[PDB]
Amino acid sequence: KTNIFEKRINLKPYEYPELNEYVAAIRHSYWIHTEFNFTSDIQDFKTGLSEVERSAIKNTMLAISQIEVAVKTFWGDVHHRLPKPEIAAVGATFAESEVRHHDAYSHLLEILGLNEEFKELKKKPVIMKRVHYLETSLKHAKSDDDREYTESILLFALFIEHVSLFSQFLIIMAFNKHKNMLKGISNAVEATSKEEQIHGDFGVDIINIIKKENPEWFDEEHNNLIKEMCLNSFEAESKVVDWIFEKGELDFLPKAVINEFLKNRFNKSLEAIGLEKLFDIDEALLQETEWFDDEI
Amino acid sequence: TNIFEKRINLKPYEYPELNEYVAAIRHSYWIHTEFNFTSDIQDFKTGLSEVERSAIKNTMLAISQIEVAVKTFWGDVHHRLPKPEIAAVGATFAESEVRHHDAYSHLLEILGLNEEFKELKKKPVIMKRVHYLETSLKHAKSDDDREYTESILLFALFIEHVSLFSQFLIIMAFNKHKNMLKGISNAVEATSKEEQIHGDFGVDIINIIKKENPEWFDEEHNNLIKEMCLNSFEAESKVVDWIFEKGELDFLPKAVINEFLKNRFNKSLEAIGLEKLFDIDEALLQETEWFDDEI
């Protein structure tokens, strides 16, 4: 008789006690940027990096920080659609973790002398288009039918948190891997990724609950709509990657390699919710980022 | 600068002073697992009378359930004050309410009082308060900006600085007067520090709204707030009667709790620039001077 969409006022008993484990998971992964040491990173950025490298780092941290503001809102609003106190508890715990994250990356931009980047956001059409896309998506996640709600969860929890943000974490961590630079920032990125992993995992679980409770909504037509949405998301993400590298590609982490890493994570997101892979993976391009998953 | 106007870009903050509240909660952050409730379980089972057990049970049920609504309020503030720095505080506060409701539901569980949540619908006094906050969450979402200071006043002050503080007082009175519930008293102290911060933020944002929109706050509006405060006090006194449905605590009578409430209602009105409403009985108020001395 359990219906994830039906409001329950009383805190206990939980109808989904297994989902409560996500609150403990984030309490375990909890971190603030002040736990890390960025002193050497500042000098690495200001003296060690090339103009092309500085620009890629600056654009990546601006993209992470600003998008996390929207991801926070998504999680803080989930209870409006899935009005269960235990789900609301996860949502609030996740929203606060996004604030710790956006504070970390805005702090890094500040200490690197890159504060002006947020003021000029309106003048960066590629990243601002992504910002508006998420603002529009937050409106849809609030007002669209329950039948379509799995698409809002898929967008934020998977396509943004498990896919888009992971490619950005990959970009930053590649500096430590290939150049032995930005070690402190790489530690903060690793701490961020562990929390984003948890977020997407919860997104997978709630999509699977919705599918289990409402099997009639998830027909062949629905699966095709998700595949088209995934292809649209990839095309949009590839354009975000092109903007990150507007001043030039990193020879140690080319765009083709980042794009293959994205396609593979999109495939894993589809598979997690019971759908078939969409992208035919180039194993040589994918092997180039195997170190990332081994590091996490 | 307009607190009600959406700003998309994270930085620069328009209200950088409000950001300090994020650091404040990160400093006060706690989980119930940091405390030891072994001695408390024993006090509840053998040290407390049936009248005392009932007051503790009702108080923790009231705190835990109301914290679920307070969490939602903070998580929704961004919808009305769409500034990323305010949204950051709101999310940080909403998560602190989850740590709090987890602490009190855990305490109810370990004391063998789990069935209390199942029977909420059958407790009209506390359930009326529950529905009042659900209704207030709808109004905090949809009413005019002109009235938004009343939603903040209700949740951040009348609930977090007043109602919940009387409930913290009830529990902490057992440690003060009977040297019992020491572990629970430590958790209540940790909760109170975070609720203090929440109300302080509520005062700051109400004061910003008043400063930016002075024309809304005329003599008629100030009288509406005073009437709302009187109504809130009358409603709170009924919640106190229900907490003590099995009988009053001789060491903390209802008259003393009610005077503590009136004094905190006065402090909340004064914080937002209004005059005191209640003419305080100093003998009744003196009885709870220890509480502020403890925290």
Numbering used by the authors:
A (entry chain A): 103 to 398
B (entry chain B): 104 to 398
From the primary publication:
Ribonucleotide reductase (RNR) is the only enzyme capable of de novo synthesis of deoxyribonucleotides (dNTPs). Class I RNRs consist of a substrate-binding component (NrdA or α) and a radical-generating component (NrdB or β). Conversely, class Id RNRs from Facklamia ignava, Leeuwenhoekiella blandensis and Flavobacterium johnsoniae are all proposed to function without an organic radical, and instead utilize a mixed valent Mn2(IV,III) metal centre. Here, we crystallized and solved the structures of an N-terminally truncated form of LbNrdB lacking the ATP-cone domain, LbNrdBΔ99, in two forms: apo and aerobically Mn2+ loaded.
The apo form of LbNrdB∆99 also crystallized in P212121 with one dimer in the asymmetric unit, but with different cell dimensions. In the apo form in NrdB subunits, the metal-coordinating residues adjust to occupy the space vacated by the metal ions and engage in a network of H-bonds to each other. Two of these H-bonds are unusually short, i.e. between Glu170 and the water molecule (2.4 Å) and between Glu263 and His301 (2.5 Å). A more dramatic change between apo- and Mn2+-forms is seen in Lys174, which is in the apo form projected away from the metal site and into a water-filled channel between the two monomers of the dimer. This suggests that formation of the dimanganic site is accompanied by a refolding of the loop containing residues 171–174 (see below). In contrast, in the apo state, helix B is an uninterrupted α-helix, albeit that residues 177–179 near the C terminus are distorted towards 310 conformation in both the apo- and Mn2+-states. In the apo form, Glu237 on helix D makes a salt bridge to Lys109 in the other monomer. However triggered, the conformational changes clearly open up a channel from the surface of the protein that leads to the Mn site, which has previously been proposed to be important for the diffusion of superoxide. This channel is absent in the apo form of L. blandensis NrdB. The metal site is completely occluded in the apo state, thus metallation would require some proportion of the population to exist in a more open form that would allow Mn2+ to diffuse in and occupy one or more of the sites, driving the equilibrium towards the more open form.
